Each structure stands twice: as structure tokens, then as C-alpha cells.
Symmetry: C3
Subunit: 599 residues, 3 copies
């Protein structure tokens, strides 16, 4: 009797109230508390020392309560803790132990999922300070850290970084660091209102597997001139990636420092996402410094079906070395992306590009080992005023990259700044199916469409096809004398080129090379002998010693004679062909020819 | 004592039964009611005025109860209401207030999600009437409406529209109208058994952001001749889209009126979906009338990796104007789609096409501003009998569209009906890597494969490559005299063309234009002079004044002489070349030549 | 009083404790048990005959309890049963009734979902025995089976097959067989640690619709030499597919027997997945034996945007016949995939290929009807030592396949073993935009890059373009005399071919065919007449009767004369052209020419 009322009102009371599911006589005879025990929320730990629930709010630090919840569920082999809807849960202090070395707030634990339906907000304790909100490392030294496995963060909720600026450029800030992370994911969450280094990082220097970010939103996560660098997701473990996410920034500083994604280990991907307001789209890089967990090669790298408005470069490739490890990047695919450089002044942000072959972080351009890249079926656009826009900026050594069936509408097709680096280039393949747009027609005074500012080019193919005129350009393709060129194929289709003074330019006469295969239009003056009948025409200039055949691209306005349709050369570098004089006389004509060498 | 039993049996009783999670002494001391209060379902509001639960069913109108649930959860800052499995919840009356102007049933509210696990069915009250089942507007005038934010509808449940036909063509019917919608989504739901205008609409005239439809099914949603028009999803806000959905119709009327998706604002996408039984795949359109919320430009438009069997056109492009706004469409990508026209009689449904450049809703063809479109890596097929099948129907002004590396197997490649509209065409690029299939070989009597029925063509490229013979076709490409052609490149590869009478046809001799670059095969009769030795051959006809070079595509069956391998022209329009007479005599030959102009 | 305490402690007690949601006076007056009844878990059925809960574990067989749960929820129109986190639930006996014919453990039922958050593990009762863990058939004969509808398995949980090997090769093992399955799915689950035939199968011989596998992981599911054959997912119903899954194997035996996916009915897809350690990627096949439910045609088949490291073939196409049904495969797309053959010895696994046109299961190569396939925008790589690597192994009759804008870097481009099958080939299209990599340069002694070991080839296109030299290869393309060739286009671009002895080889002189269109480089010796002036040069050999024109690909080192730029032929099979002797004399030269026929 008295026993009973007291029991019922006690914390043990629910364990004395019987329950059987749907009154089914074959079901377990349970107590109410057993069924309530099948789920868990923050409210089950958000209490004072006497067990009284505490309401969250700006003046309550929820950190210790959420940790206690995580720790406890961990102790039972895992489960999912709900962070309730209709409330904002503030975090107001650093965590302790292994995550202190990472400016950690909350420590994640294996098999313990968080279903965030409400909002998590940082309190002003964190203003001008570093922080990493959720950390999966269990040791201040990641090398001595245990793993995080089977940890999923998901829901319709929000992580809000409080708007606080960085205090010093050297500080780091993160949303979720999974650590040495295996089968972990973030799904559905909005990260917003911050000045951070990363929102999410996956893995640690190759350690980890099967980590993903899906259907998340990242909004306004750079806000200050102090922020040194930002990559919204960093993928540092294999068999991991980003899909169907939304990234947006409005800060000016984001246009110069912020990237959406870094893919830094093999078998990783970035797909189906939309980006606006960022400097960069994705890094695809093998850092030798990060090669411990999964080898020294980044391969099976996929960037596909994204939409981007960026201010700098869409995809940036790299590889580098340490004293004892060499990083390699190969087997990459970039496909189906629709990208534009946003409205901006020329040179007002980092040099606009669809692909950038960038130097290492110390600026070295002679360490890279990048090859077997396929860039196909993408579109790129930059507004006509943006002088600093290229399909590819090729600024460090390149061991191969293949372009097929893209549509590039920008200032340059291939570019590298003269004076600067002199890359060694092998296996650069630009197929004829790359369509060159006309937005920048008439803007190219002084400029070469393909500006080949390299140390050397080998085993390469550039097949130039225009789709409209641009008589402002100096040349379609130019090689400076300092660039060696061998075992290559270089062609300029004649369409829309009849009025161009220069089409292809070889400043060191490199097209004469034994295994250079070239064709391009040129104007040539010829003079014939006076013989009636079949009669030779010869070029007045003697700079065609390399030419294997030429043919006419001009009509013949004459009745009494015709120049040759086709020409060979002579040892003195003249062209020669056999035309026809109906009546005799020395002829003199100026004709547009297709010059060919070994093609 | 008496107090206590009564309390326990009262509605407050659960608030007197103590609970502490898993008997953990560090957990909150709560009451059973607190834990039950962490979730909510329709059953918590589906009661009579005395609080007694009401069972749902065909004779119960669940609308007021579901609204009360929504309203209440809204009052606490949101949450997710479950619509329970194992029941069908019928709706049987219109809602009241702001949604009445939209024939609204239920009003959605911000942060209030619906987890539909059971079924929602419309009662016959709605037969022959308009309706919009869930509405996110809060005002009858959308312009005066507040926003809907953070509203997600998801689950394994079903919205069933009762099979009822439309009462009048002018009526509108919708499943979910999110309104001025920000971070809202539908995931997992089946919409079925109706005659509706749309299943889901996202945004309002550019207002909204981050709205998505994912893994939903839309089955049999047009059923009558009354239905004026149908678009299963309409995307009217930016940074939004449709992915991994399934659309199917079985009605004949669907084959003539129904589209799966309309993408009508920037940064929107349609991906990874399967469509069957529809007239159309997707509209990609900027209506000037819809430009208020997000500007007058639709850009970053993506249709990718879909599978479709349709009866009309797969992708339809458009832009139009109002008295004060002009709509523009640019930066579109259409890629990876596999599409076919379903089995049907020729002309039995709207003209079959992979891409359609359509006029505005009033039929105007001189208002459009469509450019920077990339169509790449798609397949298209129509059965051999379907005369009305084209890769592109180009029926209104076009400012650019690029085709690369597609496989088109239908009746026409480029088409527009003669007599009808006369589009102004710029920057139409058909790369040589488009593979033209052979299904319609032998069906093309009287027909031009590329039928260029335009006012004019400029800055365009058509590179024709056959992969099999079709000697039934009148020509590979024809330009009527009314079509101007300038600054263009038009080529017909010779393969499978040796027996064609006409390859390329320029009915106004437009290929003579100063900046027209063309090549195609032709048969030419020549006659030589009688001279032994090097000897000229000249064409008998004088219609080659435009030709810059030609070369032989025929073997020489003669021993005693050979015609020229290559030819130029003469001012009188003859071709001329130098052959060789081993023995003298006037020769007369008929030879297949590749005619070239400026290429 | 005494009544009351006893009631409260009874299993009916929760039904006597009142509850009203959030104390809202407008909410339903319910009892605690009603709210608890909104959810259900295994714990509600995992009890002994007296209703006492039983803890799971290795010595407890949970099968009967889970079945009872399923059966009961089925009886109420469905719902979702949770399999709780933090526990491993072992299965230790076969089920009974309709699923016994399928070695069934658990029987799935319509509208009854499983949310697996914990782990399901097979007990050693199943060692060396067949089993199918979840079965949706309700009859031992699938033909007499009812349907399974609206059944979803999802969660962060795990199905673990216990590591047990197969007992005999003839046994079958499966994870989830949905049966005649309509709107069923598996999402999020890890399947691991087994030796099984399939992890998941969808549909039955065409019966079923809208079945999907998404975000699942399949890890180490083949482990023994006994395992006859493995396909991780088998898709045997239309409008179904696999997306965003992860497949990995470590067994040697997997490298020879295991495929990730079989797509075997129309409108099916495989996308966005990562594969490692498998022999094969996907089968795309129409078995006549499986044509009952959805017709005899597999069409709208999509393999897109996958990443794979395999040891055999990536995509395998097929179709076959029975006494009364003929299977057809058409309208396929393979796009955006990045694939490599993993490190292995030559010939150590089945012949490496990106695409394989395979014979039927009995080895027949003359039954297939495969056409309208598009292979575009993929990358493929095999290490240089793997002799048995091809872009396409074409081993059975082919009615069409189109390749555009791929990047293939392996030993062969087109291959079939000589001696073996002699396929009939139609409509094989290899566009010039396929980039041929250089990894295998110098490895090709004795080998033809395109080895055309067929009965016949018709309506085909091979446009060979090299991007680097490989002087080790015997030829770029070879046709044996036994292969007929007609109505085809075969071209070898000259770049990187100047030093090749053979470019294209027609061992039966098939290039002479009336409708064969060919061009390739050759070296030709010529001798002139002694005449000063315009002078003929003629070839010394007489094997050019088929040549329509040739032109020089060599420079002219002479001052006193030049050979012809262009050549025709003569009836005796000599080439002839008109050059120029500045001074007279018989000349003799050896020149590299582009030989052309009808192009
Ligand atoms: C913002 C960004 O990612 N930018 C990349 C650039 O990345 C390099 O520079 C960034 C600058 O923020 C990182 O370097 C900073 O952080 C590392 C790591 O922090 C330490 O280790 C982590 C595990 C721990 O939690 C922290 O408390 C720190 O102790 C510092 O070592 C370094 O001094 C500092 O400048 C980035 O480092 C990588 O970060 C990822 C994600 O957290 C880790 O998984 C890696 O271990 C770590 N790498 C290294 C080498 O330490 C630098 O790699 C790229 O180099 C460039 C090419 O893609 O693109 C962007 O600019
Ligand atoms: C079915 C379809 O979408 N077809 C498109 C076509 O769309 C135009 O025609 C359809 C015909 O159904 C729509 O026009 C009808 O509906 C509008 C909107 O209804 C009113 O406003 C909404 C907000 C409110 O809830 C309703 O109660 C109404 O008050 C009517 O104004 C119009 O008279 C009527 O014919 C479609 O209108 C658009 O609908 C979307 C989705 O609901 C709204 O977000 C837009 O505001 C509204 N646009 C306009 C201009 O009002 C018409 O745009 C396309 O034009 C064509 C090209 O893609 O393809 C299909 O045929
Ligand atoms: C592993 C794999 O799928 N390999 C494919 C290959 O498939 C053929 O061979 C496999 C070998 O395992 C299957 O054949 C075996 O299984 C069938 C089906 O089992 C019976 O029916 C099912 C419904 C029931 O549950 C079981 O108890 C059995 O009664 C046996 O009939 C056959 O004797 C046995 O060798 C595969 O059969 C298909 O399996 C799918 C998935 O379960 C079913 O939906 C189909 O009905 C069944 N097909 C047939 C014809 O019975 C065989 O098709 C492919 O042929 C090949 C080309 O893609 O690739 C792989 O090698
Ligand atoms: Na640190
Ligand atoms: Na490549
Ligand atoms: Na140099
Ligand atoms: Na209205
Ligand atoms: Na374009
Ligand atoms: Na005109
Ligand atoms: Na069986
Ligand atoms: Na094809
Ligand atoms: Na033969």
C-alpha cells in the first residue's frame, strides 16, 4: 500500500507498471521502463546533481550532459542518442582527456550515433578561440589514437558556429573530426554561421574507411580576414566521399581562401553537389605527409556531376614528397560537372581554371607525379572580362591528363604564366571533340589561346578546333623557343581561321622535329615558271623544309591558269607543286594553304 | 490513497509515474509522460471533443485532427508528427484561412515534419473538384505569403488521390505545395491514383531555396481527357532538385500532356530518375513571369543520368518575356541520359525529340535567349516507323547549343517543320563524335537527315558522320534558299556515301559564302585535252566556283592514263587538275570527288 | 485498492495509466500502453512460454521470436520492427512452410519493415549447409508464390554470415531474397563474413518492380574453393537497381568467381558504387529463362559513375534462348565509370576487359541479340604486364556497340582469341575520340592492337588514333583472311606511326571491297620517267588497285626534283602521280604515304 504509491512515484516506478504489446498474449510480459529504455535522448542526462532536468539555453552549458550520454550508451555497446527538436542546445566549455589536444568539445564514441533534430550552438566562450566540436580521436596524438567505428550523425538539425571570428590565423576550427574513422557518416545536417577551417574531416592520414557526407548543407563558414584557409570537407581515408551536398559562402574572404572538398586518399569521390561563393571546388592530391594509413598513391579519384560557381579553380591536382615518401596521383576522372567563374574583375581572385595542376604547398613544381587523368563531358564558362580564366592552368610537372568532349568557354584553353615555373609536360591529350566557346572572342589581343609556357612537351596531342572567329588573338597555339617539343601531334583545323595572320607558332621552329606531327593554315606567296601547259609554282620564301604536303584553301579567280591543288617541298625549303598554264606566262599568287607535316 | 488511484487513471497519471533511464543513477529523474512527450503522432490529436480517440476510415474526415497536430507542434518550435502505419487516414473537407485561396486541405508549418508511414487517401468529397493536399503558403495571395522553412515529409507511406477525375480543365490539383519554401523536402513517399496538375511543387516564382524530392514514386497521376496539363514536379526555387525518383503513367492522356519535371530557376537539377509513359521528360525554362525571387536568368541547369520512355520530347528548353522582364536560359548540361520514344504510330503524340527548342506558351519563336547548353554522352532511340523523331527539334530562336559524343538513333538529326516558324540560329555545334544510328535506314524517302528549316544559321558547325548506308534519304543535310548561312562549318564525311546522289544541298548556293567552310562528296564528269604526258582534266559543268580543292574518291580502272588525284578551280566555275596520259587522247571520266571549300 | 495494485503490476497495467500529450487539453486522452503500442521491437516477442524475456546470445536461437514478431505485425497491416542496437541476435534453425523450399530462415511479409540496428549472426548450425536468411516467397515453388510488397530493411546494423564455408558447390546461400517483390528495399545495412552465392536478390524471373539496394556494404562474402559462383546483388525485376553501395572482397577465390551486380530485367541500373577485389563488375544480360514476368527484352540498362578494381571484366553483356523464348538486350548505357584491373600476373584470372560480349552459359556464341549499346566517357587501366587486358573482348555475336570518348589504357583495344569462337559482328562503332593510352607501349611484340578475330564484320567503324609510339606491336589493326569485311570504315591516323612497318593489315585483301572505306599509312617505292619538267612517278609494286588517292607524309630532301604530292592509281595496281624534274633523269624514291580508299 504505502510501499506501492511510493515505488510508483519513485524513479523505479515505471519498472513496476506492466506492459504487453497490443495486449498480445504471445508477447513478452515487460514493464513500462523496459520499453522506454529502447530509446534515449539528451533529456535523460541533461540534469543537475539531484537528477532534476535542466532546460537548455544560452546560459546553460550542455557539454557535460551530452558527453555523459555518449559515454553511457557507449558502455552498453552503442545506440542512437536523440538531440531533441524544438530546442537549442548550447556548448560552452572544452572537453577533457584525449580530445583536449584537438581543442575538442565533445568526444564521439564507437557505435554511438547522434540523431540531431534540434540545434547545437556555440556559446561566446569560444569567440576568438580554436575548437573542434565533435572529435573521434581518443588521444591528443593521432598516431597513438584508437579508432572510431560505426558512428553516424544524422537528422534535420543544425550545428551553428556562433558567427565568431578566428582569433589568430594559426588556430584551427572544425565541426566533426571523425579521427581514425571506420564506417562513419554525416547525413542531413546543416552546418552554418562560422569562421572555420573545416566543417567535417574524415579519417587521419590514410587510416579509416567507408566514411561519407551526404545531403548536408554548409552555409557561411568563412567570415574573416584572419581565417587562413578553409576546406569544407577533408577526406583523409579511402573508400569514402561526399554526395548530394550543398555548399554556399557569401564572404569576400571565401572567394580567395575556401574550397568545398579535399579528396586525399584512394577510392574517394565527390558527386552530385552544388557549390556557390567558393574560391575552389575540390583538391585531388596525394600528400606524402599523409601516406601512412593507405599507401603513397591516390588513385580512383572521382569528381562527377557537380554544379559550381567558384572564383578560382574548380579541380586542383597535386602530389608531393617528403624525405622518405613520394606521393603519386593517378587514375582520376572528372566528368559531368557544370562550372562557372562568378562575376568578378580580372585578377581579383586566384587565377580562374577548370583544372589546375598546382605546385606543392612550398611552391615546388618539380616533385609531382600526376597521370592517367580523364577530364570528359564537362562544361565551363567564365565571363568575357575575366582575363585570368583557363580550361587548364598547367603550373607544375605533369605526367598525363586527357581531355575529351568538354565544352570550355573562357579566355585560355591551356595556360601557364611565362617567366614563372617551367613544367615538364608528358601525355597531355586535348582531343578534337573539346568545343572552344566564343564568349571571349575579340578580347584576346596579345594572347595565345593555347599558351604553351613549358620546359618541354612530349607525347602530347593538341587538336585545335574553333567554333567561331576570334581575330583578336595573336595565335591559336604558341610554343616559345625555350619549350622543347617532340613526339607530339599539333593541329589547327582551318574553320574560322582564314583571316588569321598566325595560327600555330613555333618560336624555335620546333615543328621540324623528326617525330612532330603538325598541320595548320598559312598564307604563302608563289611564283611560276612561264611555260605553257603543266607548270611548276614555287614559294618565294624558303621556310618550308619541314612540310610534307600542303593543299589549297583558296579559290582560283583566274581563267588562264590555275596554281597547284597540292604541294610538296624542296631541300632549300621552298614549296613546289604542278599547276597549269592555259596560256603561258610567269604567274604570281598569294594562296591560303593547309601546311602538313607527317599527317 | 483515493487521490492516488484517481490521479493514476487520469490523463495526468503518466506524469506521476517515475522513470530513470536504464536505472542509471546519473540520469535524469523523469516521469513516464516526459518520455512519451519526446514523440508525437496523429493519434494524439485524432479524438472527439471529450478526448476519446476516433478510428480513421472512409467515413471519418481526419483533416481537422491532422491540422490540430501540426498547429500544436508548430507552437513548440517544431518536431516530427508520425502518421501511423497499418491505417488509412482519409481527408474529406477543405482547410480554412490562408490556404483556402489554394484549394488547400492541410496547412504545413515551419519545422514541423511529417513522417508518413500509413496512407493518406482523398474521400469522394473531392471528386470533380480542385485541391492541393498540403500547402505551405499562409496567405491566399502568394505575394503576401510568409515562408515555409525546414519542413520535411518522408516515410514509406502513400498519398492516394482517390482516382477522381478533374471536373473542369481550368481546375488545379496538387499533392504538396511547399510555397515560399526554404530547406523543405519529400523523401520516400508514393503518390498514386489521380488526375492532378502536379504532385509536388517547390518554391514560388523564385522565392525559396534547398528544396528537394528524393526516392519518391509517382504512379498514375493523369487519368482523364479533362486534365489540361501535368508536370509531376515543378521546381520554382533555386538550389533545388529531383533525384532518384520513379515516374510512371499508363493513361493514353499522359502520353500527350504529362511531363515528369519542370526546372524553372537557377542551380536546379534532375538526376538518376526513371520515367515511363509520359509525353515529356523535363522542361528547362526561364519564364519572365516567374523571375521575382531569384532573377531573370535560369543557369546551372542539370539533367543527368536518367532513364526514360516518353512519347514526345525528352528535354524542352525555353525562355520568354513580359512587358517588363526578359527571361534568359544559359549554362545547361544534359548528360548520361538513356531515352527512347515508346512504341507508337507516327504522329500519334507530340513530335518525338531528344531536345526541343520550343516556342513560348503563346507560340512566339522570337523571344527566346537560350545559349551555352551542352548535350553530351546521351543515348536516344526511336522505333523505325516513327517519322516524327529528331535528336533536336529546333523550333524557336537559338543562341547556342553544343552536342558532343551522343548516340542518336531516330529519323532526323536536326529538324524544323518548313512553312512553320523560321528560327534565327547561332552557335549550333554538332561535333563529329555524335554517332548517327541506323534504325531508320531505308525509311527516309523524301527526307533530309539534317533539315535546316531556319531563317538563318551563323557560327554553327555540323559535322555529319554516317555509320551505315541509307540511300533512301534525299540528302544528309539541306539548306533551303530562304535560310542564310554564314560563318559556319558544314562537312559530310564520305563513309557510306558513295552511292548517294545528294550529300549536302544548298538550295541557295549558300556554300559560296566568304566564311563558309564546307566539304562533301559529289560526282563530277571531267574531260581532258588530248596531249600525251602531263595533261589537264576539266569539269564539264561550271558550278564549282566556290571549290578550293577536291580530291578523288574513285579508283582508276585505266592503264593508259590517270585523271588528277587533286583539283583546284577556275574563274568560270570549272574544276581543273593535272593528270597523266601515257598515250595521248581526249579522255572522258566520271569520278566521285571530295569537294572542299576552305578546309 | 487491491484490485488496483494488482492491475498496475499486471501486463495490463500500462493500459490503466492515463496520458495526454504534453498536458494539452485538446489532445487525446490515452493510456500509456497506447503510446507504447506505436512502436514495436524484437524484445516484444523474444520471450519464453511464460512471457519472460530471453537475452540473445550465441546459445539462443532468435529465429522463432523474430518470425512471431513479423507474423503479428503483418496481421495488423504492417509496421516497422526494430532489431535493437547493442545486441547480437543469433539465428540457429531453418524456418518452416513456404520458405523451406528455399532453405529459408526468416519469412518476410508485406508492409512489415525491419529496422536492423543491432547485429544478426548465423550460428554454427548453418556451417556447410545452404541457407537464405530472409525470404519473401511464400511457396516452395516461386511460380506458385504470392507477392511481397512494401517491405524495407534498413538501419546501421549488420548481417554476419558466420564465416562458414559452403559444404558443396551445388548449395545456394543468400542474405535477402525478396521474391516476387514490389516496392522493397535494403538501405544502410552491412553484409559481411561469408561464403555465399548472393547477398541480395530482387524479384523473380521478371516479376516485381521498384526494388532497390542503396548505401549498403558487402564485405568478404566469398571465402572458399567450394563456392561455385557469386553475384552480390541479382536484379531480376524491372524498374529496380543498386546505388551508392560499397563492395569488397579479399579472397583469392573472389578474383575468379565473384561479380558485384547482375542486371537482368529492363529499366535497371547500377550507379555510384565502389568495388574492390572482385572478378567482375556487372552482368547485363537477358536470360530467356528469366523472361516470364516482364518480357523477353532487357532494355534501359544503366551502369554509371562507378569505381572498380576488378580482376576479370567490368561489364559483361549477354542474351540467350530457350526452346520457346528468345532473349534480347538493347538500349544500354555504360558511362562515367573509372575501372582498373588490379595487380596480377598475366593470365592468372579471367581475361581482363572493360566490356565483354560473352557467350551463353553453355558456351554458345551464336544465340545473342545485343545491340544499341553506348559506352562513353569511361576510363580503364590495366598494368603493363597484363597481356590479357582489352577494352572489349568480343567473343560472341554482336548486333551493335558504340564507343565514344573513352580513355582505354590496356594491352588490346578490340580482342578475340583466334581459333576460338568466330563472332558475327555488326555495327561496332569505335569513334576517333577514344583515347588509346601508352602503359603497354613496348609490350606488344607479336600482337595486333585491334585483333579482329571474327567471322565477319559489317556496318562497323574503327577509327584508330594513337597518342604515343608503340613500335613493338605487329599492327594497329589486323583482319585475318577468314574475316569478311564489308560496308565499313577503317582508319589509322598517321600520328606516332611513321616508323611502323605495318599499320593496318588485311590478310585477305578485304580493303578492296566495294563499300569498304579505309585509310592508313604505308611506305612505297616509286620510280619516275627521265623527262625534264612535269614527270610521272609510279610505284614499283602493283598492290594498290584499291587505292583511290594517296598523299605524301615524307619531306623531299632533293633540290633537283620533287615527287608528286598526291597520287591516284592505274589498272595494273600501280600508283601514279605527277612530280617535277627541274633537271631530267630517272628518279627513285621511298616515301611514306597516306593510302586512301573512298575517303
Ligand atoms: C584547410 C585545408 O584543409 N587546406 C588544404 C591544405 O591542407 C593543409 O593545410 C591545412 C591548413 O588548415 C591543414 O594544416 C593544418 O592542420 C594540420 C592538422 O591539424 C593537426 O592535426 C589534427 C589531426 C589535429 O586535430 C589538430 O589539433 C592538429 O594537431 C596541422 O598539422 C598543420 O600544422 C595545420 O597547418 C592540413 O592538415 C591536414 O588536416 C587534415 C584534416 O584535419 C588531417 O587529416 C591531416 O592529418 C592534416 N595534414 C597534415 C599534413 O598534417 C594540411 O594538409 C592542403 O595541403 C591543400 C592541398 O589539398 O589544400 C588546402 O589548402
Ligand atoms: C502543369 C504545368 O506545370 N505545365 C507547365 C507550364 O506551366 C504553366 O501552366 C501551368 C498549367 O497548370 C501552371 O499554370 C496554372 O497555375 C498557375 C499557378 O496557380 C496559381 O498560383 C498558385 C501559386 C496557387 O496555389 C494556385 O491556387 C493558383 O492561384 C495559374 O496562375 C495559371 O493561371 C494556371 O494556368 C503554371 O503556373 C505555375 O505553377 C507553379 C507551380 O504551382 C507556380 O510556382 C508558378 O507561380 C506558376 N506560374 C505562373 C506564371 O503563374 C504555368 O507556368 C509551363 O509554362 C511549361 C513550360 O515549362 O511547361 C508545362 O506545360
Ligand atoms: C551467382 C550468380 O547469380 N551467377 C550468375 C549466373 O546465374 C545463374 O547461375 C546462378 C548460380 O548460382 C543461379 O543458378 C542457381 O540458382 C537457381 C535459382 O535457385 C532456385 O530458385 C530460387 C528462386 C530458389 O530460392 C532456390 O531455392 C532455387 O530453387 C537454380 O535454379 C540453379 O539451378 C542454380 O544453379 C542463377 O539462377 C537465378 O537466380 C536468381 C537469383 O536467385 C533467380 O531470380 C533466378 O530465378 C535464377 N535463374 C534461373 C535461370 O533459375 C542463374 O541464372 C548468370 O547466368 C550469369 C550471367 O549474368 O552471371 C553469373 O554467373
Ligand atoms: Na592537436
Ligand atoms: Na588519361
Ligand atoms: Na626547355
Ligand atoms: Na489561388
Ligand atoms: Na555549349
Ligand atoms: Na532568311
Ligand atoms: Na528451391
Ligand atoms: Na549504340
Ligand atoms: Na568468315
Amino acid at each position: 500500500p504505502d510501499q506501492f504509491r511510493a515505488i510508483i512515484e519513485s524513479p523505479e516506478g515505471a519498472g513496476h507498471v506492466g506492459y504487453q504489446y497490443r495486449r498480445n498474449t504471445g508477447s513478452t510480459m515487460r514493464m513500462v521502463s523496459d520499453v522506454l529504455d529502447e530509446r534515449v535522448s539528451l533529456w535523460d542526462f541533461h540534469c543537475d546533481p539531484s537528477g532534476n532536468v535542466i532546460q537548455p539555453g544560452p546560459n546553460v552549458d550542455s557539454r557535460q550532459y551530452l558527453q555523459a550520454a555518449i559515454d553511457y550508451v557507449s558502455s552498453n555497446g552503442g545506440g542512437t542518442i536523440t538531440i531533441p527538436a524544438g530546442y537549442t542546445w548550447y556548448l560552452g566549455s572544452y572537453g577533457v582527456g584525449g580530445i583536449a589536444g584537438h581543442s575538442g568539445i565533445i568526444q564521439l564514441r564507437s557505435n554511438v550515433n547522434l540523431n540531431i533534430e534540434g540545434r547545437i550552438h556555440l556559446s561566446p566562450f569560444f569567440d576568438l578561440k580554436p575548437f573542434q566540436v565533435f572529435v573521434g580521436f581518443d588521444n591528443g596524438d593521432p598516431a597513438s589514437s584508437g579508432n572510431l567505428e560505426n558512428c553516424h550523425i544524422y537528422g534535420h538539425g543544425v550545428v551553428d558556429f556562433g558567427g565568431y571570428e578566428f582569433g589568430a590565423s594559426s588556430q584551427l576550427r572544425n565541426g566533426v573530426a571523425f579521427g581514425r574513422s571506420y564506417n562513419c557518416s554525416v547525413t542531413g545536417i546543416t552546418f552554418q554561421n562560422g569562421d572555420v577551417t573545416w566543417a567535417i574531416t574524415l579519417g587521419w592520414n590514410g587510416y579509416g574507411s567507408n566514411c561519407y557526407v551526404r545531403k548536408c548543407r554548409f552555409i557561411n563558414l568563412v567570415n574573416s580576414s584572419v581565417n587562413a584557409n578553409h576546406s569544407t570537407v577533408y577526406v583523409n581515408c579511402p573508400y569514402s566521399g561526399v554526395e548530394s551536398c550543398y555548399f554556399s559562402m557569401s564572404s569576400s574572404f571565401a572567394r580567395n581562401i575556401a574550397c568545398s572538398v579535399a579528396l586525399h586518399q584512394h577510392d574517394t569521390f565527390y558527386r552530385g553537389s552544388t557549390v556557390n561563393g567558393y574560391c575552389r571546388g575540390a583538391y585531388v592530391v596525394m600528400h606524402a605527409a599523409e601516406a601512412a594509413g593507405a599507401g603513397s598513391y591516390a588513385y580512383n579519384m572521382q569528381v562527377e556531376n557537380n554544379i559550381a560557381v567558384i572564383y578560382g579553380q574548380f579541380v586542383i591536382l597535386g602530389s608531393d614528397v617528403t624525405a622518405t615518401v613520394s606521393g603519386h596521383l593517378n587514375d582520376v576522372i572528372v566528368s559531368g560537372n557544370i562550372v562557372s567563374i562568378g562575376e568578378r574583375a580580372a585578377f581579383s581572385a586566384p587565377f580562374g581554371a577548370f583544372i589546375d595542376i598546382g605546385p606543392d604547398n612550398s611552391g615546388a613544381s618539380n616533385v609531382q607525379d600526376i597521370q592517367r587523368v580523364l577530364v570528359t563531358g564537362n562544361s565551363f564558362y567564365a565571363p568575357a572580362n575575366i582575363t585570368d580564366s583557363a580550361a587548364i592552368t598547367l603550373r607544375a610537372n605533369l605526367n598525363g591528363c586527357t581531355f575529351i568532349a568538354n565544352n570550355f568557354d573562357c579566355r585560355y584553353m591551356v595556360y601557364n604564366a611565362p617567366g614563372t615555373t617551367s613544367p615538364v609536360v608528358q601525355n597531355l591529350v586535348w582531343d578534337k571533340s573539346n568545343v572552344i566557346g566564343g564568349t571571349h572572342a575579340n578580347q584576346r589581343a596579345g594572347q595565345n589561346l593555347f599558351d604553351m609556357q613549358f620546359a618541354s612537351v612530349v607525347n602530347s596531342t593538341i587538336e585545335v578546333q574553333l567554333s567561331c572567329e576570334d581575330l583578336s588573338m595573336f595565335s591559336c597555339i604558341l610554343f616559345p623557343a625555350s619549350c622543347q617539343l617532340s613526339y607530339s601531334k599539333i593541329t589547327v583545323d582551318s574553320a574560322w581561321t582564314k583571316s588569321m595572320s598566325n595560327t600555330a607558332v613555333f618560336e624555335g621552329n620546333q615543328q621540324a622535329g623528326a617525330n612532330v606531327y603538325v598541320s595548320y593554315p598559312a598564307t604563302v606567296n608563289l611564283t611560276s615558271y612561264n611555260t605553257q601547259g603543266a607548270v611548276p609554282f614555287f614559294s618565294t620564301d624558303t621556310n618550308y623544309a619541314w612540310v610534307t604536303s600542303a593543299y589549297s584553301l583558296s579559290i582560283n579567280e583566274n581563267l588562264d591558269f590555275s596554281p597547284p591543288a597540292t604541294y610538296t617541298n624542296k631541300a632549300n625549303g621552298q614549296l613546289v607543286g604542278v599547276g597549269y598554264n592555259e596560256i603561258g606566262g610567269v604567274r604570281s599568287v598569294s594562296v591560303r594553304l593547309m601546311l602538313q607535316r607527317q599527317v
